[PDB]
Amino acid sequence: RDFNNLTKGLCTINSWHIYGKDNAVRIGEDSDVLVTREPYVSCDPDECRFYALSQGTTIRGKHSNGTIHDRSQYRALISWPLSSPPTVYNSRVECIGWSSTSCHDGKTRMSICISGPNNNASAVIWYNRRPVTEINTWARNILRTQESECVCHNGVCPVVFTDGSATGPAETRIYYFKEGKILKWEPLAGTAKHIEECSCYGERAEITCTCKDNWQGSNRPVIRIDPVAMTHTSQYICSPVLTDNPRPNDPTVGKCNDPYPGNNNNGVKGFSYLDGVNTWLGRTISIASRSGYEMLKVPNALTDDKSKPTQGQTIVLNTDWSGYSGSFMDYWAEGECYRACFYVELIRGRPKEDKVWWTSNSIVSMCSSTEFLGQWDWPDGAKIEYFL
Amino acid sequence: RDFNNLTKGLCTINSWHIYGKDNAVRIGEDSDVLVTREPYVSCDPDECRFYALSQGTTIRGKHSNGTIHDRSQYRALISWPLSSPPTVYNSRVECIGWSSTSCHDGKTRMSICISGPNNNASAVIWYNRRPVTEINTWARNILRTQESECVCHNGVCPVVFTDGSATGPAETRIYYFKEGKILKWEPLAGTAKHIEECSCYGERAEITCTCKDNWQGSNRPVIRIDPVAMTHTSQYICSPVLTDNPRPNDPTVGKCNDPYPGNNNNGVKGFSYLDGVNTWLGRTISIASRSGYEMLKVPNALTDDKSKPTQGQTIVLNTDWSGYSGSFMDYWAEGECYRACFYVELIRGRPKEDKVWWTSNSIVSMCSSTEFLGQWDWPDGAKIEYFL
Amino acid sequence: RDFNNLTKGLCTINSWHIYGKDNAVRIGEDSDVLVTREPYVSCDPDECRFYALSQGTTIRGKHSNGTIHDRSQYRALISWPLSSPPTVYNSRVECIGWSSTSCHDGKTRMSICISGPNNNASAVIWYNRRPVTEINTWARNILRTQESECVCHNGVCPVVFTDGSATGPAETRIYYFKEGKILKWEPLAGTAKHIEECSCYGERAEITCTCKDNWQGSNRPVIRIDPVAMTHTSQYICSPVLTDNPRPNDPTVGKCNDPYPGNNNNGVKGFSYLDGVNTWLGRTISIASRSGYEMLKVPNALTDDKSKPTQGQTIVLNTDWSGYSGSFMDYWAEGECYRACFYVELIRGRPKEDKVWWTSNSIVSMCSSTEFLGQWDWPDGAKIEYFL
Amino acid sequence: RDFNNLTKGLCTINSWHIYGKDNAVRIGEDSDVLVTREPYVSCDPDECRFYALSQGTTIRGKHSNGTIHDRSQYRALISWPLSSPPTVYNSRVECIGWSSTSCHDGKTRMSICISGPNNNASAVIWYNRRPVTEINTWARNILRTQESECVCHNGVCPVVFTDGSATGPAETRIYYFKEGKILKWEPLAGTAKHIEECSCYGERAEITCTCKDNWQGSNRPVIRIDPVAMTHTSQYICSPVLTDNPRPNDPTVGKCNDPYPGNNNNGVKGFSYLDGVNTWLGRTISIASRSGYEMLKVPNALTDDKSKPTQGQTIVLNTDWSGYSGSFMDYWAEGECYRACFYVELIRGRPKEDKVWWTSNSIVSMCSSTEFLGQWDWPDGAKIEYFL
Ligand SMILES: *[C@@H]1O[C@H](CO)[C@@H](O[C@@H]2O[C@H](CO)[C@@H](O[C@@H]3O[C@H](CO[C@H]4O[C@H](CO)[C@@H](O)[C@H](O)[C@@H]4O)[C@@H](O)[C@H](O[C@H]4O[C@H](CO)[C@@H](O)[C@H](O)[C@@H]4O[C@H]4O[C@H](CO)[C@@H](O)[C@H](O)[C@@H]4O[C@H]4O[C@H](CO)[C@@H](O)[C@H](O)[C@@H]4O)[C@@H]3O)[C@H](O)[C@H]2NC(C)=O)[C@H](O)[C@H]1NC(C)=O
Ligand SMILES: *[C@@H]1O[C@H](CO)[C@@H](O[C@@H]2O[C@H](CO)[C@@H](O[C@@H]3O[C@H](CO[C@H]4O[C@H](CO)[C@@H](O)[C@H](O)[C@@H]4O)[C@@H](O)[C@H](O[C@H]4O[C@H](CO)[C@@H](O)[C@H](O)[C@@H]4O[C@H]4O[C@H](CO)[C@@H](O)[C@H](O)[C@@H]4O[C@H]4O[C@H](CO)[C@@H](O)[C@H](O)[C@@H]4O)[C@@H]3O)[C@H](O)[C@H]2NC(C)=O)[C@H](O)[C@H]1NC(C)=O
Ligand SMILES: *[C@@H]1O[C@H](CO)[C@@H](O[C@@H]2O[C@H](CO)[C@@H](O[C@@H]3O[C@H](CO[C@H]4O[C@H](CO)[C@@H](O)[C@H](O)[C@@H]4O)[C@@H](O)[C@H](O[C@H]4O[C@H](CO)[C@@H](O)[C@H](O)[C@@H]4O[C@H]4O[C@H](CO)[C@@H](O)[C@H](O)[C@@H]4O[C@H]4O[C@H](CO)[C@@H](O)[C@H](O)[C@@H]4O)[C@@H]3O)[C@H](O)[C@H]2NC(C)=O)[C@H](O)[C@H]1NC(C)=O
Ligand SMILES: *[C@@H]1O[C@H](CO)[C@@H](O[C@@H]2O[C@H](CO)[C@@H](O[C@@H]3O[C@H](CO[C@H]4O[C@H](CO)[C@@H](O)[C@H](O)[C@@H]4O)[C@@H](O)[C@H](O[C@H]4O[C@H](CO)[C@@H](O)[C@H](O)[C@@H]4O[C@H]4O[C@H](CO)[C@@H](O)[C@H](O)[C@@H]4O[C@H]4O[C@H](CO)[C@@H](O)[C@H](O)[C@@H]4O)[C@@H]3O)[C@H](O)[C@H]2NC(C)=O)[C@H](O)[C@H]1NC(C)=O
Ligand SMILES: *[C@@H]1O[C@H](CO)[C@@H](O[C@@H]2O[C@H](CO)[C@@H](O)[C@H](O)[C@H]2NC(C)=O)[C@H](O)[C@H]1NC(C)=O
Ligand SMILES: *[C@@H]1O[C@H](CO)[C@@H](O[C@@H]2O[C@H](CO)[C@@H](O)[C@H](O)[C@H]2NC(C)=O)[C@H](O)[C@H]1NC(C)=O
Ligand SMILES: *[C@@H]1O[C@H](CO)[C@@H](O[C@@H]2O[C@H](CO)[C@@H](O)[C@H](O)[C@H]2NC(C)=O)[C@H](O)[C@H]1NC(C)=O
Ligand SMILES: *[C@@H]1O[C@H](CO)[C@@H](O[C@@H]2O[C@H](CO)[C@@H](O)[C@H](O)[C@H]2NC(C)=O)[C@H](O)[C@H]1NC(C)=O
Ligand SMILES: CCCN(C)C(=O)[C@@H]1OC(C(=O)O)=C[C@H](NC(=N)N)[C@H]1NC(C)=O
Ligand SMILES: CCCN(C)C(=O)[C@@H]1OC(C(=O)O)=C[C@H](NC(=N)N)[C@H]1NC(C)=O
Ligand SMILES: [Ca+2]
Ligand SMILES: [Ca+2]
Ligand SMILES: [Ca+2]
Ligand SMILES: [Ca+2]
C-alpha cells in the first residue's frame, strides 16, 4: 500500500514469550529437510516467515557431508512458513548466494544475496522478486552482509556490508536502497573498529544495528542510522556485560569507543535492544563456545560503562548448543508500540558434534511481553545418536 | 466481514453422518506424518480444518520414541486441510505449546498456546496470526486449557482455563477475549467441583461447555456461558448415563450438583449436546479404558436425574481404541440451524499398544443428520505389527 | 457467477488428442502416492482436476496389502491437480466413502460420497465444501453411484444411484439436486433392465448417460435426462459393436431395448458420445478382460441396430491393462461447442498382477480434435518387477 | 491485462549475474525429485518459473533406469517455482509430450506439447490451461519444436517447428499463434539450411531466434521474425567464434549464409543475443562434448565474418558437464530495457556418466548486469558415487 514508517517506539520488555520454533533437526531425521545455517526471521504486512541459507541438500542426504563449509555454489537464501521446518517442498528461494539480508518496505520485499569466489564476489539486490541492482566486491575479500533482516523507513532500507579482512581493519559500507536502487552509500564512520553481521531494528525513525567486531572486540559495536538524513554514527555498547563469543569474563567497567580486549579474531553474530532503561542484551552463556543463550536487562547498556543486569531470562541452557542470534519485529502488528523479537540459531553437528559429517541448525524465536512471564529453556531437541 | 453472532438453534439430531477422517497412522506408516495427540476440528468462514498438538517428529522417525509424554518444548498447535493427515509439508503451526484452543470470530482467528515448565507456564493469545496477549500461570501447576475449539459471539470468545491440582480443587477461570485482548475474567462458580478440558458449542446466544472432572466425577460438569453479560453457571449432567472414562457402571439415578463417585483422579476429555429432547451424549463404550465410542440420545440429560437412552449410534467398536472427543460446528454454513458436529481421537501406540515406542492418533469426525441414517463403525485402521 | 447452462452442442470428433496422464504407479514406486481406483476427471470454471477413491495408504506402504477390496472405512473421494499423481501431500479430500460423483454447477461444486456397511449405507451430498443433504439406503444392498462426474444445467445436477442386487433387478433412482438439496427423484423407467455406474455428459440442454448393465447386457444401457422437465428415458445402444467387458463377440445386429445376452453378472464402467453421425464408442479391446482400450466411430450407434465402425483410434494396446472409463467435458472452455473428453483407468496389481498384494491404477485422458491426428498408445508404464 | 508489446531494447550487457539455480540432482539424491531434461525458464507477469520435460519417475526410483531415451509416453512439460527442484509435489504439468515450448502473452500463457510415435506425432496448443488447437505431423518424422520459451508481441506468439530428417533437409515452419489459434504459418526461408531447437528473445518489435543446424553447421542459424508483418528471414551467425557442439576449432573467418563445415549430424541447443556491439554468444568450452560453458562478447557477430571476442565470462568449468542452453527475459520487469537472461542445462548421468542407469539434469541461469561483475563457475554439484 504505502511505505511503512517507523513511527512507533518499542513496547516495554518485562519478559520474553515463545514466538516460533521449527524443530528442524528432530523432524529432518526422517523427512526431506534442507541443511541450513545463518537463519533469521522477517515479516511482510500479511505474514511472518523463517529465512536461512540452504546448503542445497537434505540432512539425511549424502551431500550433507561437508556442510560445515560456509560458501559454495549450492547455497541460496530460502524462506518458509513460520515454525515449519525448511523442507525441499515448502522452501521458497529468494536468491542465490552465501550471505544475505532481506526486508519488506511496506509495499514489497527487497532480498540481497552475495555469491562468488573470495576474491570476486558480488551482491545482487532483488526487489518485488526481480533482480534490480548489482554491486561488485570493492576490497576483493569476501563481500558479505547482515545475515538477518534489514529495516525500511518511507521506502529507504539501509543495509550494512563489509568487504576485506576479518582480522584487521576492513571496508564497511552503509547502502541506502529504495525500490532496490542505490540512493547513496557511505563508508563506516564513528568509533567502531570492525563491523560484521549487523542485527538491526527500527523505532521512532531511527535504525539501530548491533553488530560484531570480529577483530578485537568482545563488547559489540553499534551503528545507529538516520534513514531520512541517510547518515549514521557508530560506537560500542559501554556496558561491562560482554556479549560476543568467545569473550573474557565480565569486568566491572566496559568500553564505549574501543573494543574490549581479551579475544581476537573470532565472535558470533548477536543483537540487542538499546532503549534507555528498557534495554535488553542477548548472549551465549558460555564465554568459550556457542553454548546456551540468555537475555539480560541492562538499563542504559549503550551509554553506561558500569551498567549491570537488573533482570534476566534464560533462553537456552548452557548444556545446549546455540549459535547466531538477531533481531526482527513485526512492523505491521496492531497496537501503539513495536514488539521486540529475536531468534537464536541452534547449531547441530560440526564442529562440536563431529560424529556426524554435516552441520545444520533449527530456529527458536521469542518476542517481548509487558507481563513478567515464567521462563522455560528451548533446546534444538534432536539426538545426534539417531543420525549415526 | 462482521463478527459472527450465535443466532441459530441446533438442527434436530436424528443420526450422525461421516464428516471427516484422515487415516493418519495408516498413511504415516510410509509417509512424512507428524506424531500428534489432543486433536480437534475448527471452522473459518471459508474452510474447516483439523487441528492437533504435534510432537515435533514423524511417526516413523526415531524421535517418535517417547511421544507418550504430554509436555515438551517440541510440541506446537498445528492445523491442516480437512481429512488430510498432519504431514510435515501441509501442517501450519498456529503457535508453540502443549495445551491449546482456537476459534474464528467471523473476522479472524484467535489461537491460544500454553507452554512452560509445570511450575512456570504461560499462555499466549494470538489473533490474526500475531501474538497479542500473554497470561502467566496463577497457581503454578500446569496452566492448561480446552484442547478443542472455543466459540465467539459478537467478537467475544470465552475460554476456560485451569491451573493447579488435577486431583483436588484447582483454580479454573473463564476469560472473555475480544480481538485477542482480555475484556474480563471470572473464577469458576456454580456446583462443578473440578474443571478440565472443556468442549464447547454455541446456539441462540449461549455457549455450552461439557468438561471433565478429573478429581471425583464420572458424570461430566457443564459450564453455560452468557457471552453478552459475560457471566456463567456450572453444574453436572444429571443423567445416570455416565460419560467419563474410567467410570463405574450406570446407576438408575445420577447427580445434578455433585460428582458421581466411584472413580478418582482420572478421566478423558469428552462432550455433549444439551438441547432438551434433542440431547445426545458421547462416551467410550468401555467403562475401564479409552475403547470404543458411541453417541446416545438421552432426552433432558442435563436436568433429568433419571434420564436414559431413547436412541443411539455406535461410532467406534469396543474392540478399537478411541480417546479424546470434542465439539465444533460450522457457524458459517447455510440454513436455519447449526449442525452439531464432533470428533473422536483414535489413539494408537502407548500405553495400550506398547510394542511400539510412540503414541499418536488419527481423527474421525461426524456431524448430525435430520435423517435416520444407517450406522458404520470407524476405526483407526492401522496394523501395529507393520510398525515393528 | 451464474449457473452454467448446456447451450452448446458437441464439437465434431475427427480424432482424440492427449489431455492428461499422471503416471501414478511409475512415480509412486519411489514417492508418497496414495493407492486409488475408480478415478475420473472434472472441471471447475477455472481449473480441471483428477479425482479418485483413495484407499487410505501409499502404494509402497505396508497397508497397501489388501487394497483389491472395494469398500472400507479408509476410502475417500480425493481430487488433485491435472496430470499430477495423487500424493499424500497434494490430494484434497472431497468427502469420505467408497462410491462417489462430483460436478460443478457454475457457481460451486457438489460432491457425493456413500459409505457404510452393505446393508446400511448412506449418501451425503456436499455443496460448496459443506455437507447439506443425506440419503439413507432404500434397498439395503450397497447404495452406490456413478464413479464419474455428474452434469448440471441452470443449477440442476441429476445423479443416478442404484441400490439392491448386481445380478438381478435393482432399484435405480435419478435424483435432481440444486445447491445440494433434493428437488425431486424418480425411479428408473424405460427399457434398460439394470443400471450401474453411469458416465454422463451434457449438450443442448440434454444429459446423456452411458451406464452398465451388470446383470445381463453386453450392450450398454443409456439414460437420457431432461434437466428442465426433470424427466428421463432409457434404452440400450442398438449397435452390434458391443462395449461392455467381458462380452461375447460382435454380432451383425444388436438390441435396442433388451440386454444383448452371452455374459451374465459382470461388466466394467464405460461410456460413449451419442451424437448422430458424430458418435464414438469406447471399449476394451479384449472381450475377456480389462485389457486394451479403443475408440470407434459408429455413426448412429444408439438408434441403428446394424451400425458398424467407420473410423477408430487405439488408446491402450491389448497387451496393456485398462479398466474403468468415463466422460467429462470442460463446460467452461472458449469456443462454440463442447469438446468431448474421457479418461481410462489403467489398473495395476490385483487380480491380474498378483505378485504384488495391492491394487491401484494411473489415469490417461483424451479430448476430441477436429483434426485427423496420428495415434499413439498410452500404457500405465510401470514395471511390476520393481515392486517385488 | 493487455497483450505485452516488445517496446524496449536490450540493456547493455557488461557481465552476467546469478539468477537461479536449483541443485536438483544434489537434492534429489535423497528427496522426491523428478528425472528431467530439456529445461528452460519462462516468465508470467507476476512470477518467473523453471520448466522441463519430466521423465515420469524420480531419480532414485527404479523407473529412472533408461531415462537416457528422448521420447516416451511418460514425459510431460512441467513447471515449478524458480530455483526449487522439480519435485513430485511442486511440479505443475502444463501438457503431455516429449518436445515443447511455452510463453505468456501478457494476458495468459500458451504451452505446446508434441507427442506420438516417430511417424505419427502431433502438437497440441494449450492457452489459458485449456487445449485449443492441434497440428498433425506434416513430414511424418518426429514433429518437434523449440525446447525453450517462445515470445509474444500484441498477442501474436511465433513458434518454430521442424518435421523430417535431422541429417538432411527437413520441413521447418514458423507458426504465428494468437490465443492458441493459428493466424498463419510459413515455410522456413532464407539461407539457413537446417533448423532445430530455436532459442528466442524479443526487443523493439522484432523476435530473434538462434537455433541449431544439426545436419552440417557448427556456426548457428538465426531466424529473425517480424510478429506484426508475420514474416521472417534466416541466415547464420557470420562470426568465426563457432558456437555449436561438437564443432571444429575456430577459424579466422566464418560463414554468413552457409553452414560452417567440419562436423555433421550432431549439435546441441544453444542461443545468443545479437545486438550490434552489445552481442554475446554462449557456447560449451569443449569442441568435442557438452562440457563447460562460457559467454563471449563478440561485437557484430551476426554480420561480421571476422568478429572475435572482446570480453568473456566463464559460466561452467570445462571439467563440468553442461548441455542445452537457451534464452528468456522477464518482459514484465521495471525499467527502460529488457535484461537478457539464459539458462544452462547441467546434464548428469548417461551417456557420460554411465555408472548410473539414468540421465537427468539441474539448471543454472544468469541475467545481464550493466556492472562488470566478478565471475564464479556454477557446476551441478552432485557426486555420482553417492548414487551407486
Ligand atoms: C519462574 O519464572 C520467573 C521468570 O523468569 C523466574 O524468575 C527469574 O529468575 C531468574 C533467575 O534467577 C532471574 O534472572 C536473573 O536475574 C538477575 C538480576 O536480578 C537480581 O539482581 C537485581 C539487581 O540487583 C535485583 O533487582 C533482583 O532482585 C535480583 O536480585 C541477573 O543478575 C541474573 O543473571 C546473572 O546470573 C546468571 C546466572 O543466574 C548468569 O548466567 C548471567 O550471565 C548473570 O550473571 C553473570 O553476569 C554478571 C554481570 O557481569 C556477573 O556479575 C555474574 O557474576 C555472572 O558472571 C559470570 O557468568 C557470565 C555468564 O556465563 C560470564 O560471562 C561472566 O564472565 C561470569 O563468569 C539472572 O538473569 C529473572 O530476572 C527472574 N525474573 C523475574 C521476573 O523475577 C522464577 O525463578 C521462575 N520460578 C521458578 C520456580 O523457577
Ligand atoms: C442400520 O442402521 C440403524 C441406525 O443406526 C440401526 O438401528 C439402530 O440400532 C442401534 C443398535 O440397536 C440402536 O441403538 C441402541 O438404541 C437403544 C435405545 O432404543 C431402544 O430403547 C428405546 C427406549 O426404550 C426404544 O424406543 C427403542 O425402540 C429401542 O428399544 C439404546 O438403549 C442402545 O444403547 C444401549 O445399549 C448399547 C449396546 O447396544 C450400549 O452400548 C449402550 O451404552 C446402551 O446400554 C448401556 O447403557 C444403558 C443406560 O445406562 C444401560 O441400561 C444398559 O444396560 C447398558 O449398560 C451397560 O453398558 C454401558 C456401555 O458399555 C456401561 O457403561 C454400563 O455400566 C453397563 O455395563 C443403543 O444405542 C439405534 O437407536 C438404532 N437406530 C435407529 C434409527 O433405529 C440398524 O440396526 C442397522 N441395521 C442393521 C441391519 O444392522
Ligand atoms: C497414423 O495415425 C492415423 C490415425 O489414427 C492411423 O490411421 C488410423 O488407422 C486405424 C487403424 O487402421 C484406423 O482404425 C480402424 O478403423 C476401421 C474403420 O475404417 C475402415 O473401414 C471404414 C468403413 O468401411 C472405411 O471407411 C475406412 O476406409 C477403413 O477401411 C475400424 O473398423 C478398425 O476397428 C476394427 O478393427 C480393430 C483392429 O484394427 C479392432 O480392434 C476393432 O474392434 C474393429 O474391429 C472389430 O470390431 C468390428 C465391428 O464389430 C468387427 O467387424 C471386426 O471383426 C473386429 O471384431 C473383432 O475384434 C473386436 C475387438 O477385439 C471383438 O470385440 C470382436 O468380437 C471381434 O473379435 C480400426 O478402428 C483409423 O480409423 C485410422 N484413422 C484415420 C484418420 O485414418 C495411421 O494408420 C497411422 N499411421 C501409421 C503409419 O501407423
Ligand atoms: C574477477 O572477475 C573478472 C570478471 O569476470 C575477471 O576478468 C575477466 O577475465 C576473463 C578471463 O580472463 C576475461 O575473459 C576472457 O576475455 C578475453 C577477451 O579480452 C581480451 O581481449 C580483448 C580483445 O583484445 C582485450 O580488450 C582485453 O583487454 C583482453 O586482452 C577472451 O578472448 C577470453 O576468451 C578466450 O579465451 C578463453 C580461455 O580464457 C577461451 O575459453 C575462449 O573460448 C576464448 O578463446 C578461444 O576462442 C578464441 C576465438 O576464436 C580463440 O582465438 C582462442 O584461441 C580460443 O580458441 C580455443 O578455445 C576455444 C574454446 O575452447 C575453441 O573452441 C577453439 O577452437 C580453440 O581451441 C575470455 O573470455 C573477461 O573478459 C574478464 N572480464 C573483465 C570485466 O575484465 C577477473 O580475472 C577475475 N579476477 C580474478 C582475480 O580471478
Ligand atoms: C509514510 O510517510 C510518507 C510521507 O513521507 C507517506 O507518503 C505519502 O502518502 C500519501 C498517500 O500515499 C501521498 O499522497 C504523499 O505524497 C506520500 N508521500 C510523500 C513522500 O510525501 C506514506 O503514506 C506514509 N506511510 C504510511 C503507511 O502512512
Ligand atoms: C452481529 O451483531 C452486531 C450487533 O451487535 C453487528 O454489528 C453491527 O454491524 C453493523 C455493520 O457492521 C454496524 O454498523 C453496527 O454498529 C455493528 N455493531 C454494533 C456492535 O452495534 C454485526 O454486524 C452482527 N454480525 C452479523 C454477521 O450480522
Ligand atoms: C443460465 O440460465 C438462467 C436463466 O434460466 C440465467 O439466470 C438468469 O440470470 C440473470 C442474471 O443472473 C437473472 O437476473 C435472471 O433471473 C436469472 N435466472 C432465471 C432462472 O431466470 C443464467 O444467468 C444463465 N447462465 C449463464 C451463464 O448465462
Ligand atoms: C500493445 O499494443 C496494443 C495496440 O496495438 C494495445 O491495444 C490497445 O489497448 C487499448 C486498451 O486495451 C484498446 O482500447 C485498443 O483498441 C487496443 N488494441 C488495438 C489492437 O488497437 C495494448 O494495450 C498494448 N499493450 C500494452 C501493455 O500497452
Ligand atoms: C495436570 C494435568 C491434567 N490434565 C488435563 C492432563 O494431565 C491431561 O491428560 C491427558 C490424557 O490423555 O489423559 C493428556 C493431556 N496432555 C496434553 N494436553 N499435552 C494432559 N494435559 C496436560 C496439560 O498435560
Ligand atoms: C453391488 C456392487 C456392484 N458394483 C457396481 C461393483 O461391485 C463395482 O465393481 C467394481 C469393479 O471394478 O468391477 C468395483 C466397484 N467398487 C467401488 N466403487 N469401490 C464396485 N462398486 C462398489 C460400490 O463396490
Ligand atoms: Ca569479537
Ligand atoms: Ca473423572
Ligand atoms: Ca454386463
Ligand atoms: Ca551442428
Coordinates of all heavy atoms in Angstrom, one line a residue, chain D residues 2-6 103-108 110 127 151-158 176-181 183 207 227-228 230:
Chain D
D2 N -3.4 -6.3 -20.7 CA -3.3 -6.1 -22.1 C -2.2 -7.0 -22.6 O -1.4 -7.4 -21.8 CB -3.0 -4.6 -22.4 CG -4.2 -3.8 -22.8 OD1 -5.2 -4.3 -23.3 OD2 -4.1 -2.6 -22.5
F3 N -2.2 -7.2 -23.9 CA -1.1 -8.0 -24.5 C 0.2 -7.2 -24.4 O 0.2 -6.0 -24.5 CB -1.4 -8.2 -26.0 CG -2.5 -9.2 -26.2 CD1 -3.6 -8.9 -27.1 CD2 -2.5 -10.5 -25.6 CE1 -4.6 -9.9 -27.4 CE2 -3.5 -11.4 -25.9 CZ -4.5 -11.1 -26.8
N4 N 1.3 -7.9 -24.1 CA 2.6 -7.3 -24.0 C 3.1 -7.0 -25.3 O 3.0 -7.7 -26.3 CB 3.6 -8.2 -23.3 CG 4.9 -7.5 -23.1 OD1 5.0 -6.4 -22.5 ND2 6.0 -8.1 -23.7
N5 N 3.8 -5.8 -25.5 CA 4.4 -5.4 -26.7 C 5.9 -5.2 -26.5 O 6.3 -4.7 -25.4 CB 3.7 -4.1 -27.2 CG 2.2 -4.2 -27.5 OD1 1.8 -5.2 -28.1 ND2 1.5 -3.2 -27.0
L6 N 6.7 -5.7 -27.4 CA 8.1 -5.6 -27.3 C 8.5 -4.2 -27.6 O 9.1 -3.9 -28.7 CB 8.8 -6.6 -28.3 CG 8.3 -8.0 -28.2 CD1 8.8 -8.8 -29.4 CD2 8.8 -8.7 -26.8
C103 N 5.0 -19.7 -23.6 CA 5.2 -18.3 -23.4 C 3.9 -17.6 -23.0 O 2.8 -18.0 -23.3 CB 5.8 -17.7 -24.7 SG 5.0 -18.0 -26.2
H104 N 4.1 -16.5 -22.2 CA 3.0 -15.7 -21.7 C 2.8 -14.5 -22.7 O 3.8 -13.9 -23.1 CB 3.2 -15.2 -20.3 CG 2.0 -14.9 -19.5 ND1 1.3 -13.7 -19.8 CD2 1.4 -15.5 -18.5 CE1 0.3 -13.7 -19.0 NE2 0.3 -14.7 -18.2
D105 N 1.6 -14.2 -23.1 CA 1.4 -13.1 -24.0 C 1.0 -11.8 -23.3 O 0.8 -10.8 -23.9 CB 0.4 -13.4 -25.1 CG -1.1 -13.7 -24.6 OD1 -1.4 -13.4 -23.4 OD2 -1.8 -14.3 -25.3
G106 N 1.0 -11.8 -22.0 CA 0.7 -10.6 -21.2 C -0.7 -10.8 -20.5 O -0.9 -10.3 -19.4
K107 N -1.6 -11.6 -21.1 CA -2.9 -11.9 -20.6 C -2.9 -13.3 -20.0 O -3.3 -13.5 -18.8 CB -3.9 -11.8 -21.7 CG -4.2 -10.4 -22.2 CD -5.3 -10.4 -23.2 CE -5.8 -9.0 -23.5 NZ -6.8 -8.9 -24.7
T108 N -2.4 -14.3 -20.7 CA -2.3 -15.6 -20.3 C -1.2 -16.4 -21.0 O -0.6 -15.8 -21.9 CB -3.7 -16.3 -20.3 OG1 -3.7 -17.5 -19.5 CG2 -4.1 -16.8 -21.7
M110 N 0.5 -19.7 -23.2 CA 0.3 -20.7 -24.3 C 1.5 -21.7 -24.1 O 2.6 -21.3 -23.9 CB 0.5 -20.1 -25.7 CG 0.5 -21.1 -26.8 SD 0.7 -20.5 -28.5 CE 2.4 -20.0 -28.4
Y127 N -3.9 -22.9 -24.3 CA -4.0 -21.5 -24.0 C -4.9 -21.3 -22.8 O -6.0 -21.8 -22.8 CB -4.5 -20.7 -25.2 CG -4.4 -19.2 -25.0 CD1 -3.2 -18.5 -25.1 CD2 -5.6 -18.5 -24.9 CE1 -3.1 -17.2 -24.9 CE2 -5.5 -17.1 -24.7 CZ -4.3 -16.4 -24.7 OH -4.3 -15.1 -24.6
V151 N 8.1 -16.2 -27.8 CA 7.9 -14.8 -27.4 C 6.7 -14.3 -28.1 O 6.4 -14.6 -29.3 CB 9.2 -14.0 -27.8 CG1 9.1 -12.6 -27.2 CG2 10.5 -14.6 -27.4
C152 N 6.0 -13.4 -27.4 CA 4.8 -12.8 -28.0 C 4.9 -11.2 -28.2 O 5.7 -10.6 -27.5 CB 3.6 -13.1 -27.1 SG 3.4 -14.8 -26.6
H153 N 4.1 -10.7 -29.1 CA 4.0 -9.3 -29.4 C 2.6 -9.0 -29.8 O 2.1 -9.5 -30.8 CB 5.0 -8.8 -30.5 CG 4.9 -7.4 -30.7 ND1 4.3 -6.8 -31.8 CD2 5.5 -6.3 -30.0 CE1 4.5 -5.5 -31.7 NE2 5.2 -5.2 -30.6
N154 N 1.9 -8.2 -29.0 CA 0.5 -7.8 -29.2 C -0.4 -9.0 -29.4 O -1.3 -9.0 -30.2 CB 0.3 -6.8 -30.4 CG -1.0 -6.2 -30.4 OD1 -1.7 -6.1 -29.4 ND2 -1.4 -5.8 -31.6
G155 N -0.2 -10.1 -28.6 CA -1.0 -11.3 -28.7 C -0.5 -12.3 -29.7 O -0.9 -13.4 -29.6
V156 N 0.4 -11.9 -30.6 CA 1.0 -12.8 -31.6 C 2.3 -13.5 -31.1 O 3.3 -12.8 -30.8 CB 1.3 -12.1 -33.0 CG1 1.8 -13.1 -34.0 CG2 0.0 -11.4 -33.4
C157 N 2.2 -14.8 -31.0 CA 3.4 -15.6 -30.5 C 3.9 -16.6 -31.5 O 3.3 -17.7 -31.7 CB 3.0 -16.4 -29.2 SG 2.0 -15.5 -28.0
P158 N 5.0 -16.2 -32.2 CA 5.5 -17.1 -33.3 C 6.3 -18.3 -32.6 O 6.8 -18.2 -31.5 CB 6.5 -16.2 -34.0 CG 6.0 -14.8 -33.7 CD 5.6 -14.9 -32.3
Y176 N 2.3 -18.6 -36.4 CA 2.0 -17.4 -35.7 C 0.7 -17.7 -35.0 O -0.3 -17.9 -35.7 CB 1.9 -16.2 -36.7 CG 3.1 -16.0 -37.4 CD1 3.4 -16.7 -38.6 CD2 4.1 -15.0 -37.0 CE1 4.7 -16.4 -39.3 CE2 5.3 -14.8 -37.6 CZ 5.6 -15.5 -38.8 OH 6.7 -15.2 -39.5
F177 N 0.7 -17.8 -33.7 CA -0.5 -18.1 -32.9 C -1.0 -16.9 -32.2 O -0.2 -16.0 -31.8 CB -0.2 -19.2 -31.8 CG 0.3 -20.5 -32.3 CD1 1.6 -20.8 -32.3 CD2 -0.6 -21.5 -32.8 CE1 2.1 -22.1 -32.7 CE2 -0.2 -22.7 -33.2 CZ 1.2 -23.0 -33.2
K178 N -2.3 -16.8 -31.9 CA -2.9 -15.7 -31.1 C -4.0 -16.4 -30.4 O -4.9 -17.0 -31.0 CB -3.4 -14.6 -32.0 CG -4.1 -13.5 -31.2 CD -4.0 -12.2 -31.8 CE -4.9 -11.2 -31.1 NZ -4.5 -9.8 -31.4
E179 N -3.9 -16.4 -29.1 CA -4.9 -17.0 -28.2 C -5.0 -18.5 -28.5 O -6.1 -19.1 -28.5 CB -6.3 -16.3 -28.3 CG -6.3 -15.0 -27.6 CD -7.5 -14.1 -27.9 OE1 -8.5 -14.7 -28.4 OE2 -7.5 -12.9 -27.6
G180 N -3.9 -19.1 -28.8 CA -3.8 -20.5 -29.1 C -4.3 -20.9 -30.5 O -4.2 -22.1 -30.9
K181 N -4.8 -20.0 -31.3 CA -5.3 -20.3 -32.6 C -4.3 -19.9 -33.7 O -3.5 -19.0 -33.5 CB -6.6 -19.5 -32.9 CG -7.7 -19.8 -31.9 CD -9.1 -19.2 -32.2 CE -10.1 -20.2 -32.3 NZ -11.3 -19.8 -33.2
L183 N -3.0 -18.1 -36.8 CA -3.3 -17.0 -37.6 C -2.7 -17.2 -39.0 O -3.3 -16.9 -40.0 CB -2.7 -15.7 -37.1 CG -3.2 -15.3 -35.7 CD1 -2.5 -13.9 -35.3 CD2 -4.7 -15.2 -35.7
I207 N 11.7 -10.4 -33.2 CA 12.0 -11.6 -32.4 C 13.2 -12.3 -33.1 O 13.1 -12.6 -34.3 CB 10.7 -12.6 -32.3 CG1 9.7 -11.9 -31.4 CG2 11.1 -14.0 -31.8 CD1 8.3 -12.5 -31.5
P227 N 6.8 -10.1 -35.9 CA 5.5 -10.6 -35.5 C 4.3 -9.8 -36.0 O 3.1 -10.2 -35.8 CB 5.6 -10.6 -33.9 CG 6.5 -9.4 -33.7 CD 7.6 -9.5 -34.8
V228 N 4.5 -8.6 -36.5 CA 3.4 -7.7 -37.0 C 3.1 -8.1 -38.4 O 2.0 -8.4 -38.8 CB 3.7 -6.2 -36.9 CG1 2.5 -5.4 -37.4 CG2 3.9 -5.9 -35.4
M230 N 4.3 -10.7 -39.7 CA 4.2 -12.1 -39.7 C 5.1 -12.7 -40.9 O 4.6 -13.5 -41.7 CB 2.8 -12.6 -39.8 CG 1.9 -12.1 -38.6 SD 0.2 -12.8 -38.5 CE -0.4 -12.6 -40.1

